[PDB]
Amino acid sequence: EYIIKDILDSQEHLLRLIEELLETQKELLEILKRRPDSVERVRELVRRSKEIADEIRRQSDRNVRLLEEVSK
Amino acid sequence: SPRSYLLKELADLSQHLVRLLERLVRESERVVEVLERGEVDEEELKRLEDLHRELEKAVREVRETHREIRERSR
Numbered sequence: 794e795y796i797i798k799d800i801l802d803s804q805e806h807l808l809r810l811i812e813e814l815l816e817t818q819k820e821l822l823e824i825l826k827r828r829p830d831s832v833e834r835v836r837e838l839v840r841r842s843k844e845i846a847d848e849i850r851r852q853s854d855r856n857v858r859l860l861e862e863v864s865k
Numbered sequence: 866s867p868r869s870y871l872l873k874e875l876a877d878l879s880q881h882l883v884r885l886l887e888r889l890v891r892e893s894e895r896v897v898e899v900l901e902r903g904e905v906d907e908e909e910l911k912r913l914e915d916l917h918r919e920l921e922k923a924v925r926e927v928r929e930t931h932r933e934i935r936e937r938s939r
Contacts, residue, residue, distance in 0.1 A: 797868075797934065797935075797938045800872075801931055801934065801935065804875070804879070804927070804931060805931075807879075808924065808927065808928070811882065811886065811924065812924070814886060814890075815886075815917065815920060815921070815924075818889055818890070818893060818913075818917065819917065821893055821897075822893070822910070822913050822914065822917065825896060825897070825900060825905075825910065825913075826910055828900070828905070829900075832897060832900070832901060835897050835900075836897065839890075839893065839894045839897060842890045842893065843890060846886055846887055846890045849883060849886060850883055850887065853879050853880065853882075853883045856876075856879060857876045857879055857880060860872045860873070860875055860876040860879075861872075861873070861876060863872055864868075864869040864872040864873055865869075
C-alpha cells in the first residue's frame with residue numbers, strides 16, 4: 794500500500810525545500826564575497842532562511858517519526 | 866531488516882542534514898554582522914563555503930540512501 798513510496802515522496806519534497814534553502818544561502822554567500830555596500834538583500838535572505846529552516850526542521854522531525862514507525 | 870537498517874540510517878542522515886543546515890543559517894547571519902562592521906577576514910567566508918560543501922555532500926548521500934531503499938522495495 795505505498796508505505797515506502799509515501800515516505801520517499803515526503804523525503805523528496807523535503808529535499809526540494811532544503812535545496813531552496815541552500816540556493817538562498819548560496820546567493821547570500823556570493824553577495825558577501827563581493828562586499829556589498831548595502832545589506833538589505835542579505836538581511837532579507839537571512840530572514841527567509843530562518844523561515845525555511847523552521848519548516849525544514851518541522852518536516853524532518855515528522856519524517857523521522859514516520860521512519861521509526863515503519864522500521865519496527 | 867535490510868530495509869530497517871536503511872530506514873534508521875535515513876533517519877540518522879536526515880537529522881544530521883537538518884542540524885548542519887541550522888548551523889549554516891546561524892553562521893551566515895553572524896558573517897553578515899561581521900561585514901556590517903567591516904571586519905571580514907576571508908576565513909569566515911571559507912567556513913561558510915566548507916559548510917556548503919559538506920551540505921551538498923550530505924544531500925547526495927541522502928539521495929543514494931533513497932536509491933538503496935527503492936532497489937530493495939521492487
